[PDB]
């Protein structure tokens, strides 16, 4: 039926779908985008947007040991986002709730500002605020057998093969089932909002804050830790002032943290988050609350699950606490203190198995992010810092970073000889002579420190160690002699 020359469209819809699913490089994506961007339906337009953020990270990792990234790529990555952003606005009226989530996240993830998208999202947010926060609201259903004329405008059903869909039985006694969808859209609106669309975005968010505050029920499945962080930053960036909404949001976060700790038995092992395990099935995908056993398939090459976390982790605690510092004035002190204590308990329990310490690996970026929030909030605790130092590798850190870590441990009253020894030993191996002291570089800091700068770092480390009260050791003695 689709043979010959099409006088209206240059490319067949089915062929265009094949190319989109077959993208692995930005150059290939640019070839598709720059030719057929005006002939994509909402299904195709939003699919491209979601892939672009992942393709950019892939190319940065293709660089070999002795090569460098091509300078022409990053400019092209933002060029493609702008072109797809315009097409997203044109077909915005025909997108589903899920499709709007994909397009909005891609621009927000890439930190690309677009006035046209921000204005379109502002109107949509107002419409969805009164519908998704209603008590008598039902979950989004993918099991569509006879689509309506308006659903034929989404492009999902213009396919020559089976359309994958979720095979779960939708809950029938859920309260506000689509809260997570609303939280993500609001965060995208704040991030994508530009200079000429800031007023509209703020007004839409203010109405959402008032509606959220004037609510006497909690969603039956409590909002995910990620969703809570996104909503908190949506208010912080937009400057919405509503203590009633802010306090309620922190209440939900407090409730979730307690629930995770209450339903945890230490005998089983270290605390781990609850997650959704998604598997591929004949008619689509299925979500489970617990993992399957490893399986060998006769047809699939990969049977591993996609893990979507629902509880809090160290990564999310460094973003929720960051939002709290921005919104400190709107949060009661009592609620802030309770959350801080729960955060410490979550960290301590997550790195203990049986009766012995089992540290969990962390990165330097994560540690600094958590500590920075604590300094702003003025929270001092040794139960939150000690687990973070045991799981932090100290082999590729610069001399400056080691000095800062030692100072932080002393201020937080950390009492663990192993932590102190692992820091001084690493610092000593980085302090070289030649008659000028040289402090090596590393992940922690940029460049090397020579002369007085190296001496200052050594003095700070010695001061922290002296206050801590460590017994004399070879590493400290050599540092003192050099400085």
């Amino acid at each position: 039926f689709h043979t010959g020359v099409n006088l209206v469209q240059p490319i067949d819809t089915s062929k265009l779908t094949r190319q989109i699913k077959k993208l692995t490089l930005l150059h290939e994506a640019a070839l598709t985008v720059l030719q057929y961007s005006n002939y994509c339906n909402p299904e195709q337009a939003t699919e491209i947007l979601r892939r672009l953020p992942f393709l950019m990270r892939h190319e940065e990792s293709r660089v070999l040991k002795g090569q460098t990234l091509d300078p022409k790529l990053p400019p092209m990555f933002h060029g493609l986002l702008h072109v797809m952003g315009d097409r997203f606005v044109q077909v915005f009226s025909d997108c589903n709730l899920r499709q709007i989530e994909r397009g909005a996240w891609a621009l927000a993830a890439a930190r690309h500002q677009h006035d046209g998208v921000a204005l379109a999202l502002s109107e949509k947010l107002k419409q969805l605020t009164q519908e998704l926060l209603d008590l008598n609201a039902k979950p989004f259903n993918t099991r569509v057998t006879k689509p309506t004329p308006e659903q034929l405008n989404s492009g999902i059903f213009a396919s020559r093969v089976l359309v994958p869909e979720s095979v779960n039985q939708l809950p029938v006694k859920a309260v506000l089932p689509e809260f997570n969808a609303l939280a993500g859209i609001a965060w995208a609106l704040a991030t994508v909002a530009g200079e000429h669309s800031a007023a509209a975005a703020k007004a839409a968010l203010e109405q959402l804050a008032e509606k959220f505050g004037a609510l006497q029920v909690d969603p039956k499945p409590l909002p995910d830790a990620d969703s809570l962080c996104r909503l908190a930053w949506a208010f912080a960036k937009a400057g919405v002032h509503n203590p009633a909404a802010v306090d309620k949001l922190f209440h939900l976060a407090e409730e979730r943290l307690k629930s995770q700790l209450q339903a945890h038995d230490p005998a089983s092992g270290p605390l781990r988050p609850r997650c959704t395990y998604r598997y591929k099935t004949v008619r689509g995908w299925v979500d489970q609350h617990f993992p399957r056993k490893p399986r060998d398939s006769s047809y699939l090459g990969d049977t591993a699950p996609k893990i979507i976390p629902r509880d809090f982790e160290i990564d999310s605690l460094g973003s929720l606490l960051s939002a709290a510092a921005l919104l400190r004035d709107q949060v009661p002190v009592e609620r802030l203190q309770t959350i801080l204590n729960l955060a410490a308990q979550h960290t301590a329990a997550s790195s203990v198995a049986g009766g012995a310490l089992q540290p969990l690996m962390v990165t330097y970026e994560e540690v600094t992010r958590v500590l920075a929030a604590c300094e702003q909030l003025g929270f001092r605790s040794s139960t939150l810092v000690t687990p973070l130092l045991h799981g932090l590798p100290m082999a590729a850190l610069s001399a400056e970073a080691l000095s800062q870590l030692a100072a932080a441990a002393t201020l937080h009253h950390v009492r663990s000889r192993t932590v102190y020894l692992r820091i001084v030993r690493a610092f000593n191996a980085k302090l070289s002579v030649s008659p000028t002291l040289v402090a090596g570089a590393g992940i922690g800091a940029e460049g090397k420190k020579e002369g007085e700068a190296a001496a200052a770092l050594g003095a700070q480390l010695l001061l922290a160690v002296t206050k801590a009260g460590l017994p004399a050791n070879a590493s400290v003695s050599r540092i003192a002699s050099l400085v």
């Binding site: 993830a109 962080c229 959704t276 006769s298 893990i307 540290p359 045991h390 009492r415 001061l463 922290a464």
Partner: protein
Amino acid sequence: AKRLLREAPPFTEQVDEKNFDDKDYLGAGAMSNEQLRKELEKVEPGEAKWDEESPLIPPPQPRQYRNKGHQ
């Protein structure tokens, strides 16, 4: 032939979708070195004892991967 009995081995380009970081955090407005020195000096030299630790502490354990629900 053109028809395969199972998925082909992963010899083509593999785009990874795991551990994508897009959260918002604070800035880098940390304290100055002089302020840290003053804070350390203010620390009281409390004569406390060290905690009782196990003779052998295992090295850090890697964390499991995470995905996103924007499928």
